[PDB]
């Protein structure tokens, strides 16, 4: 015997036209003629924009930093468009088209001599950013099961989360960082310049609080 629990019914969720993912270009319509420098600030540190849900309910959250190019875009597009339901589900991009150029040199060339040639374009993604945001009248288990593949194939570590999961993990993070037992914390030490540790630390560590190291993000470090 088992008591019958009611099913979640969705009727206010309106499925828009063209629910599948759109096509992205490997090189934009206006290619950058002037070669730029490879700034690492676009990867280092937490993400500032596109950190919350706009219209969707599930998303692919990136717990790290890296670059995304046309190959990964095509992989995600094909996988989602072939494993999604266009009648009950819709998807949307949270990252723009690849615009940052990357310079390369052919083998056999010595160091120096000038800048290389623009080979391809990538999209900088920071830790804590959503990549693909999906919605519809579907449950969370199926979208999670079918998005974990894309989350694994992505370069940085990624997870298929939702509003509830993100809120729960953020509440857990706040609870841990407020009930931590040891009185010595990385943020306190870096702000008070204890032991002269600023000689070893970085000026961005004062803001990262020891949570972001290069491109990696360890959420279990208070």
């Amino acid at each position: 015997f088992k008591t019958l629990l009611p099913v979640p019914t969705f009727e206010d969720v309106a499925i828009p036209e063209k629910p599948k993912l759109r096509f992205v270009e490997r090189v934009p319509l206006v290619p950058k003629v002037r070669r730029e420098r490879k700034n690492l600030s676009d990867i280092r540190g937490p993400s500032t924009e596109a950190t919350e849900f706009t219209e969707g309910r599930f998303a692919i959250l990136a717990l790290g930093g890296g670059y995304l190019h046309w190959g990964h875009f095509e992989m995600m597009r094909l996988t989602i468009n072939r494993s999604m339901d266009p009648k009950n589900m819709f998807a949307l991009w949270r990252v723009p088209a690849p615009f940052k150029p990357i310079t390369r040199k052919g083998m056999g060339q010595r160091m120096g001599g000038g800048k290389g040639a623009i080979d391809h374009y990538v999209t900088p993604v920071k830790a804590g950013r959503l990549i693909v945001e999906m919605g519809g009248r579907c449950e969370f288990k199926e979208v999670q099961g079918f998005l974990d593949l894309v989350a694994h194939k992505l370069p940085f570590p990624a997870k298929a989360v939702s509003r509830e999961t993100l809120e729960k993990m953020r509440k857990d993070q706040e609870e841990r960082e407020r009930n931590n037992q040891n009185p010595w914390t990385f943020e306190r030490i870096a702000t008070a310049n204890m032991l002269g540790i600023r000689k070893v630390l970085s000026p961005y560590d004062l803001t990262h609080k020891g949570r972001y190291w290069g491109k990696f993000y360890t959420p279990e470090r208070v």
Binding site: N179, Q181, N182, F186, I197, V200
Partner: peptide, 10 residues
Amino acid sequence: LMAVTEYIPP
């Protein structure tokens, strides 16, 4: 510093 500032659960 990381080893010292590791998290301790209650």
